[PDB]
Structure formats: structure tokens, C-alpha cells
Amino acid sequence: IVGGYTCGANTVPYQVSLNSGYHFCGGSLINSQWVVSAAHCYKSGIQVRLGEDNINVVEGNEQFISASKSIVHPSYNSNTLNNDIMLIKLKSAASLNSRVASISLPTSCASAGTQCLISGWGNTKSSGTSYPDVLKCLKAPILSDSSCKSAYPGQITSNMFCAGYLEGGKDSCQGDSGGPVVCSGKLQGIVSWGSGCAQKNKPGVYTKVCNYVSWIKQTIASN
């Protein structure tokens, strides 16, 4: 997260870190056995880490559970990143409490202007790599479709939305991929891509979760 602030330990209880010997992506806990992340974060050997704050120190509240299966959306296109969503089923259920809690799926899409919270352990520099030890937060608004399409002409599908600041300085960045964009208490986006980090006129692009709610519910119901 570039231009963000320290969230405070366990203030984002649905945030998870996907770990394969190191933190590589974020994700959101939606029920005690399922996590939603981005299809581009897929790999085998994933250990999901819940109740984390400092990812390099065990401090208490952490739950490390291995993933039993990862379901990448069947129509995920790795070249356009359209349908960039993946569901991970955990080997055992997480113990939920106030430090580890699930986030609700939306019942409607959000409108531009809606203010949202984006969080993650990704890079905090737009030029160079500086990964933090603790979770960073950023409040960003959803942008109108014309500003998003004018920023990335021909690269935005109806399953994507832009959120951020055109003046630059604040944005999600690598290491944040797969993580949550929560607005009014609902999971509305997943950190997907952007051109560089915090560059002027290049806002972040997020998977529009309101378009996959029936798919998420049907897929969890059948697995």
C-alpha cells in the first residue's frame, strides 16, 4: 500500500496473508472455511495465515491453516485479468472471534464516490520495493466508469472498477494482490492490477465482486 497508514493489530479481522514460505498475496475470509483472493495469486502449496499483523513475528492470535483446494474462476483470462477471482477452501475451519472474523458479500454493487478500505502487506514505494512487516490501510473512493476507461482505454471489462486517486501518491501495489476493498461493511473488490503504483492518472483496478456473488454461493454450495 503506498500512501497508507498502519491499520493497528487485528483491526481488519477478515484479512488473510497467503504464504508459500513467504507472503505473496492477500485474501478475505468470507466464512470459517473459505477465503476469496485473485486468480492470479494461484499456486500450489498455499498456507493461509489468519489473525496476522506483523507477518515476520508470531505474537499471538495467528491461525495457520493449509488450503485443501483453490478454485480459479473457469473464465479467468491471464492476459486481460478478466474474472480475476479464486476461492480457497481451508483444510479445517478457522476459529472465528473478534480478531479473525468473516466479511459479508454485497447485495448490490457500489457507486462511484463510495469510500472503501483497502489493506495489505504489499510494497509501500511506487519506485523501488519496501515491504512492511505490519498491515497497512488506505481509504480510497470508487471512481466513475468514464475516468476508469479514460485511464486504461480498452482494458477495463464490466467485471472491473477503478478506485484510488488520479493525482497519484496513494494506491495498492504488488504484495497487495488478492486482498480486500471493503465499502460500507461489504467486500466489493479484490486488488487485481494497475500500471505501476501510485502514478498520476493510473488508478488501481479491482475485480467487481458484486458480479460473482451467485457464482461464489453456488460454488461453495457444491464443494
Ligand SMILES: NC(=[NH2+])c1ccc2[nH]c(-c3ccccc3[O-])nc2c1
Ligand atoms: N497499482 C496497483 N493498484 C497495483 C495493484 C496490485 C498489483 N499487483 C501487482 C503485481 C505486480 C507483480 C506481480 C504480481 C502482482 O499482483 N502490481 C500491482 C499494482
Ligand SMILES: [Ca+2]
Ligand atoms: Ca505475526
Ligand SMILES: [Cl-]
Ligand atoms: Cl475504451
